């Protein structure tokens, strides 16, 4: 059967768009690139089995690689529960180009348990559905051709303690639909037999220094490792090491600071060398950026961006699209939600309980937004205490449930060190899943103490970490304030507005507060600036206003769920949110 | 000299047959079989040395391996106190087949610290005297052949705080005779330059699976593993993996589930390949069962095997013997105990404070006898209260004595963890070194989640692990209770009965309850088992009657200490032994 | 410029005899010979440069290598404070008969953190003012010749948290100049691809036993390792090793044991083969002896070598020296000051917060001093309760300051694990960063057992480690006793003498009594000495005088900071130090 976007809901402009033949097309990693690689998204077969029968040979449907189960553009639009599992199946050759050289499998992300056959042997397994994860899978290719893939997912949702986000079995108010399967670019990859596995890159402008630190999949004495750093064509800095040592890069001390304002980016070559001969090579970005918190004239921590006070003013991006649920249906629409952000004077995203493809942060670190990434949540939750200092019951997780937690949380830092955008990890938020708050927030801290941590989004508040995060809706207040912390307001606004034509459910819509026109509305959201403006000069060091789009029933977005909309007067908000974005300059 | 059993104790019809020159030639290791071997029992050199001694050239005396140096069967008959130091010398030569095979020297046990010589070269060294181990002993031969094996052995006994079991230096009540040096087959193995070096089998009937992990010396990327499970001679399933991943096996749903009623076992056939060539080869088996605890229908917490509630009821089995002590003196005479067991109705077995030879469980797995496991006691103990939860003062291991329990323990339950028999891990008895119950049996049960944890056979009782332990003497009696776990009587009975031909002992033995003959002895024993069957509907969800045989002056066990007499009529207890095995039944 | 010393300060008699193209020619690492080296100290090309600054390539000035550029020796003299970076750069040839080879760069101490580049390839990179450390530097060699050799080096003396012992920025009474750079000897050394990188040599007297572990670089299953120990020119014991086991040398029961008046050295010929080709060679020393406490007849605790009660009584040795700070002139003068302490009677030496080279050490073993090694304190510090138990508030050090502490401290105990002198371990003196005393002693006696802990040298107090540590100044005092353990006297006396012409300054000179001439300060050493002698049976068991040398202002040594003054009757101070050495004697 031709392949058709599922279900009767509302649909974006790209899902018209989709080509099965060329699906999700562009580099899944642009923070380390090589120039040879094969993208195996598309139609594969796809069947859904009770949990633990027979994996099936004959396959009667098909699903669009990389769009979840219960996506619309997977061609699918069905629903899995905890006690069945899906099963991918497709063919795939090796170019001829590539023999004799190790080829890794790739997958972008996978909710939630994934374990992976190639020729029917069994290549590697992964749990967690935000982190990416590889296969070295030569050993099993097949000198005839024709190999076969096999793909076995599965995910409890809420059923399960695992990280889900927004996830649940039965989607209401805040809770949206589940998201199941292979949501990223599946491809494969030659390298050479030693070859780089990782580039940590981590930057200090106050040493005028960057490092480079090139994880190998093997190691010998033999190795060497050269990093040269260009700005623009012209080479302006470059290092050397042997001995498994991180490359330090002595940079210029006039380099170009990247900011919002001024997202410079230096490109990275990295090469690795047995002795003297050339094995691997790989290109890269960096950016040369600080983030901290230090207490200005007047008494109050702000944060700052290389040792400059910057109030950090962004919408929270929950990252849904209504055809394709976790997967954004063409690069284009990836990058649209970023650059109306910027559109609309904002120089911050709060990635809301969610990790986005590699792509994505990417295009923050071209476009120049910070970005506070959040750690998915999940599990049962305590008492929220959302108004004081938490004195209730604290929460015990089993110890499988903590373990998954604390290897996901790690998995989730490792692959997103990288990054310049990011500049906030968020371990919690409005205490759901939230336990042993000060622990984990100075194992986040210790963890990589280039960024700030924000210990929970709104509760439950613990004295640690580098920032109170107060919520409060509809208009912005501070009831409690943190004299030794910077203190911000990591979720507010949340004005609803319910266009027609262009919402997912009839009935039901929600805001927390709701006008019938889009005047209404933005008259609402400069008033609530206007506030936040004054609240800077008293105590507030970074707000987030909800929401980027609308999600399913909660129409309290700056743009409808579809994109087709834009709710709020792109032109009034982006004069007081440029305003507060500027609060702290001098 | 010529080689004769030492002392004029009873001794076991197997003493008179056995042959030093084809002592104990089974192989040592059903669970991993490859073809060829040697085994290394026999008379050695020995000779008893002051502690810290020359380790002498010349010897007066031989001894037969592997039977303890104070057990009669090995021509010795000695003691040996904590300031000696056993010495074993031996030669050997290597068949000309295994040139170029790595040759490892397999010990199944030795008590208690080991060292080994090969050619005057440090081969290896072991602590525990109930866990196997193994060394390369490649580098240490010679070209001209006569390789000289030197074994070291020290033993403080009672003296130390190492587990020891009923091992003590003045035996007396419930304490039996020291067992110092090998007490189980030396044995010989050639094996390729990467070889499987043990099989982690697992089993999940729920998911309709078989895990093979094959653990290997060395790790390559080409390494490849192939597991053919066979039904009889049918090949049923096959499984394949690489990159170090364990090997899943898609059961059948049809498969033939292990039970005491109904022991079947799979055949397992897995093979390495280095790329496309075959390098080496085990032979195995498998069953598919399920150990758990369920509360039933009236509310009761229930001892599960394979989904259903299932009263798990057998002897206390010390295994010892008045000739060999530790070591059985034939295969037929480890048989023949198990084959006992099940001739009584009983579809269980409690190891008391010992670990046994490989060959025991397996038989235990052919026959169908489930397993209780304990972990064999040492050091000191805290006040032992058996009828309350305890509220007394905690004992205090040194920072030694408790990393050699945690140690032994987890090398137990690794060595052992493939066998299907066993379904519980005991880690205390009657509070004999307890310490730190709730984290041991938290850590136990997280190492091994297949099995149910017992944390304290007979006290002190703790809210943990799967079931609560008690103890009583004579009769059976339920004075504690948790509605939250199973509730087991770990140890009752204890009918005493003194043969006149037949004991360790002119007088001094002892029973719990003691009668004049057999007939007296077998209606005390139906007595308590009437009891005990009524007491199923009652609470207890399974019970270990003590004992197998008679230990010394201990004489309350269903056989003599050298097995010739059976003392409680078999018929009239298997007919109320099998009704309670039964009692349960749906 | 042409090298000459700096300053107008006092100079010891070998300041003048230093020749810049010779500079502390001996060989670095007695313990673990090998034939060939080339030493790189002399003259070197050097820079002052701010933090994060452009290491230069043209330099203005030279530095006298390893002699600390605040030193008078260095040619240099001058400050550096935690803003400053110091630049090290020097050209080196490799030998042509060193083809081949593996080429090692070692650095006998750095003050504090180093990052060292070979031809503008970084080698490796350290942190910590007193331990070596070893960088394979052979991929970054050049062909051509000339290689470049830069080493970069931060120290923040005490405005971090690292240790730093008595260096501080603004020295005054006790706190002396700050040591920045490289202090101890560099050099070059060859070795084979696989080679013994460091020797764990372990006695055992009471089993007649001597363990040598031969630490590789790397591990094959065929290498092979031989020990042979040598009475004089007699081989009197051999050992063999493979699978990396310890080389366990059964020694004579006869054995020479070691002692301050008898230290008797064995030799040691450690060879490693790979099968039957040897490949490396080292030449080292042992000593058979023991340290331990037991408790006498009189029922007090004393310190026991070899079994024996013995009273330990020593200076204490700072290790400054007016010209070359840290580091001594030349090997003459470093020998000086143990040669001297022997000389005076005494039999123990404690050495004050700070870390020998390696030579100085073997000095001790050769000439009979047995070591109190001290942990080099730094960080801030809690409430000393010197004279009682301490009840106080503890203090809590940053996760970064106790890493350092804890890492510097394990490679302190590593690189002197193999010294016969060193008999205690002392982490903490007058609670300078005291933390978790309790847990580092415990730590420090269960890593290393063979030594005793003295937990807090003059407080804070608690009831932990193997002896009680009592300052009192000037008298000898017992206000406090251990019944438990053994009571001390680590620091007592401090009779200072001003001799004009022989001080670092003018002004502000110091003791803790003052006196006018040498027969005054004598008379007061042997009233001081007389009251130890009795309290010797009273509790005490150890001593140690302050101090050996003056330093800066604190005029109160033995000798004066110039090495050029006995300031004390030597004859009169001998003749009472050894009746209190022997005072145990039975
Ligand atoms: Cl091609
Ligand atoms: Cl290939
Ligand atoms: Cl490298
Ligand atoms: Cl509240
Ligand atoms: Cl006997
Ligand atoms: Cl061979
Ligand atoms: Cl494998
Ligand atoms: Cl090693
Ligand atoms: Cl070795
Ligand atoms: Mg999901
Ligand atoms: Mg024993
Ligand atoms: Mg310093």
Known sequence: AQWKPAGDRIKTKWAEQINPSDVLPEYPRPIMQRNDWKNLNGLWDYAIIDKGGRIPTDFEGQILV?????????????????????????????????????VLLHFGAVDWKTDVWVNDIKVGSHTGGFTPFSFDITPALSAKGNNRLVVKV????????QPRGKQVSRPEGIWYTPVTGI???????????????????TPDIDRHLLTVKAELNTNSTSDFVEVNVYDGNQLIAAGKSINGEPVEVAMPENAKLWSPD?????????????????????????????????????????????NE???????????????????????????????????????????????????????????????????????????????????????????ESEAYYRKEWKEIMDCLHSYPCIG????????????????????????????????????????????????????????????????????????????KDHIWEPNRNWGYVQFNSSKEATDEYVKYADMLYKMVDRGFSAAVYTQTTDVEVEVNGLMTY???????????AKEINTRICNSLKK
Chains 1, 2, 3 share one sequence.
């Not at 599965?154 to 303690?161: L, S």
């Not at 968020?426 to 986040?444: D, H, L």
Request: proline share 6%.
């Open 424 to 499: 906030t990890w968020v371990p919690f938020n409005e205490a759901w899943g939230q336990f042993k708050t000060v622990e984990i927030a100075e194992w986040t801290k210790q963890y990589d103490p280039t960024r700030l941590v924000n210990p929970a989004s709104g509760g439950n508040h613990y004295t640690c970490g580098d920032m109170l995060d107060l919520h409060n809706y509809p208009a912005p207040e501070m009831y409690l304030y943190d004299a030794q912390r910077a203190t911000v307001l990591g979720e507010y606004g949340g004005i609803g507005l319910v266009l």
């Open 154 to 161: 599965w995910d409890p949702t809420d059923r399960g303690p």
């Open 262 to 306: 001024s997202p410079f980016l230096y490109t990275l070559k990295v090469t690795l060398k047995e002795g003297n001969k050339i094995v691997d090579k790989v290109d890269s970005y960096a950016a040369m950026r600080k983030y901290s918190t230090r207490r200005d004239a007047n008494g109050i921590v702000r944060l700052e961006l290389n």
């Open 562 to 572: 579809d994109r087709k909309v834009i709710k709020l007067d792109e032109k009034r």
């Open 309 to 399: 006070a910057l109030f950090q003013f962004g919408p929270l991006d929950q990252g849904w699209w209504p055809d394709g649920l976790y997967t954004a249906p063409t690069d284009e629409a990836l990058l649209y939600d970023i650059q109306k952000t910027k559109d609309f004077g904002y120089n911050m995203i709060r990635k809301h309980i969610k990790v986005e493809p590699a792509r994505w942060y990417t295009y923050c670190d071209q476009l120049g937004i910070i970005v506070w990434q959040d750690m998915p949540s999940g599990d049962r939750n305590p008492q929220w205490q959302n108004r004081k200092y938490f004195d209730g019951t604290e929460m015990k997780r089993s110890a």
């Open 183 to 201: 949501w990223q670019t599946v491809w494969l990859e030659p390298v050479a037999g030693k070859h780089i596995e990782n580039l940590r890159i």
């Open 66 to 102: 990389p769009f979840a189960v219960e996506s619309s553009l997977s061609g699918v639009g069905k629903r899995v529960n905890e006690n069945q599992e899906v099963i991918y199946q497709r063919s795939f050759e090796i170019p001829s180009a590539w023999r004799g050289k190790q």
